[PDB]
């Protein structure tokens, strides 16, 4: 396919083209400012992934359970019958909640690992 | 709390607000230069931290032992009786030594890992 070629495909199918999208995120004052901003934006997403305990990965899962209040739609109903563009609207009011949980259930993990390594 | 809210507290309590501080580090020529510099500064710390074998972590530890000459001040009665601002001055003349050691006792680990993975 190519960049955004999977945009109309289901989430399951589209999850296999993440590499394509990631590689297209990176590369007179108005134009230079646009370039600096593209870098700041990129770095914020990378920082956020690092905070959540998910660094050099395109796909990673965590210990935060899905709350059914966050638009439960079965499971196969989402992955085999919805596009990412639609999913993005289904849970648009919950992303800040989810992100906060993702950060908290990392700090808990880092402390537990630090203590386990202290045992002899 | 909030950004720098734990600045006046002990190292112990302050260690639990690392996420808060990290998120506030990252986001006409002179204004643009300031933004570019902030990015270069950020990246240098991330590079350094990555070289030491500590990548997507706010807390990590290594095999470099603490030397008693580096401001040997107990542990429990100091860690929880001192702020980070104070600690920073207590060892300000040793950070270059420590940083050098952190890199050496990483390069050694990468070579050992590469050799172990070569055992059929």
């Amino acid at each position, epitope marked *: 396919l190519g960049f955004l070629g999977a945009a109309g495909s289901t989430m399951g199918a589209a999850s296999m083209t993440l590499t394509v999208q990631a590689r297209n995120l990176l590369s007179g004052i108005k134009q230079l400012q646009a370039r600096v901003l593209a870098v700041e934006h990129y770095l914020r997403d990378q920082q956020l992934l690092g905070i959540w305990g998910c660094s050099g990965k395109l796909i990673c899962c965590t210990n935060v359970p899905w709350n059914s209040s966050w638009s439960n739609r079965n499971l196969s109903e989402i992955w085999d019958n919805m596009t990412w563009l639609q999913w993005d609207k289904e849970i648009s009011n919950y992303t800040q909640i989810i992100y906060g949980l993702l950060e908290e259930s990392q700090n808990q993990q880092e*402390k*537990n690992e630090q*203590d*386990l390594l202290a045992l002899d | 709390l909030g950004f720098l809210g734990a600045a006046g507290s002990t190292m*112990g309590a302050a260690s639990m607000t690392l996420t808060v501080q990290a998120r506030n580090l990252l986001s006409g020529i002179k204004q643009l230069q300031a933004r570019v510099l902030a990015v270069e500064h950020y990246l240098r710390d991330q590079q350094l931290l990555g070289i030491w074998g500590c990548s997507g972590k706010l807390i990590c530890c290594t095999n470099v032992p603490w030397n008693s000459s580096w401001s040997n001040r107990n542990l429990s009665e100091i860690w929880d009786n001192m702020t980070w601002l104070q600690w920073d001055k207590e060892i300000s003349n040793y950070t270059q030594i420590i940083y050098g050691l952190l890199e050496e006792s990483q390069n050694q680990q990468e070579k050992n890992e590469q050799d172990l993975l070569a055992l059929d």
Partner: antibody
Framework: EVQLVETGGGLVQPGGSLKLSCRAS????????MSWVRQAPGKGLEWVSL????????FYVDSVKGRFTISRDNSKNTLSLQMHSLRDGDTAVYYC??????????????????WGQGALVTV | ALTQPPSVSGSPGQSVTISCTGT?????????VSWYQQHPGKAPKLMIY???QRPSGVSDRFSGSKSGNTASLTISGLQADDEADYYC???????????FGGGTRLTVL
């Protein structure tokens, strides 16, 4: 001044369950890791379980590993142990104690500092 | 299990030593071999910790040491007040965590 006081216990028929608990005062509950130690009638002392101070890490002796749960509540200053599938060999006095592992910032102990008097469990 | 079951005794005012023999890695590699004093019907109390330390409230009458894979507790100016069961225990290295010994009873007279 440490006050570790056990409750619960009593006679449970084999295959049954019970919950023990220990309330604590004097010392900041949240500052210490805690354990349960068993005193069988003629054995004296056996370690059973350990929980860290934040209540996130638990360890068990293999013999109760698939049966017992250890838990802490730092707002209540309460330690508890939920026992399931009890056997005759579990008859013992169960002691509440502070000590064992620590936080990695605090000169970990690996010994027990304080003991309660112990709840009696008969199966 | 750590081993120290034989009864122990001695005359008042005389020293007495209670041994604690381990296996290999438990008391050989870890300097975490505490001792407890157990009265017949009371909760035990800590006497010795690490290898040679005592908590406040424990007198100099109680001290101890370790060599090889064997540890010991020594009582100096032995009193009738020392008639208690004694137990040694040690850190096992994260797999079993703690091992208690088969303890022993001290008789003074």
């Amino acid at each position: 001044e440490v006050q570790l006081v056990e409750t619960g216990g009593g006679l449970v028929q084999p295959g049954g369950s019970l919950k023990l608990s220990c309330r604590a005062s004097g010392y900041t509950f949240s500052s210490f890791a805690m354990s349960w130690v068993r005193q069988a009638p003629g054995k004296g002392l056996e370690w059973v379980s350990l929980i860290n101070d934040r209540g996130g890490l638990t360890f068990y002796v293999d013999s109760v590993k698939g049966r017992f749960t250890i838990s802490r509540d730092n707002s209540k200053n309460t330690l508890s142990l939920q026992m399931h599938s009890l056997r005759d060999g579990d008859t013992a006095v169960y002691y509440c104690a502070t000590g064992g592992m620590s936080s990695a910032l605090q000169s970990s102990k690996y010994y027990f500092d304080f003991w309660g008097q112990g709840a009696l469990v008969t199966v | 299990a750590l081993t120290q079951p034989p009864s122990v005794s001695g005359s008042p005012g005389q020293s007495v030593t209670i041994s604690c023999t381990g296996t290999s890695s438990d008391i050989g590699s870890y300097n975490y071999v505490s001792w407890y004093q157990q009265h017949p019907g009371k909760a035990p109390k800590l006497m010795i910790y690490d290898v040679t330390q005592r908590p406040s409230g424990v007198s100099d009458r109680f001290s101890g040491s370790k060599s090889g894979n064997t540890a010991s507790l020594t009582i100096s100016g032995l009193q009738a007040d020392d008639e208690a069961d004694y137990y040694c225990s040690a850190y096992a290295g994260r797999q079993t965590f703690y091992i208690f010994g088969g303890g022993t009873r001290l008789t003074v007279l």
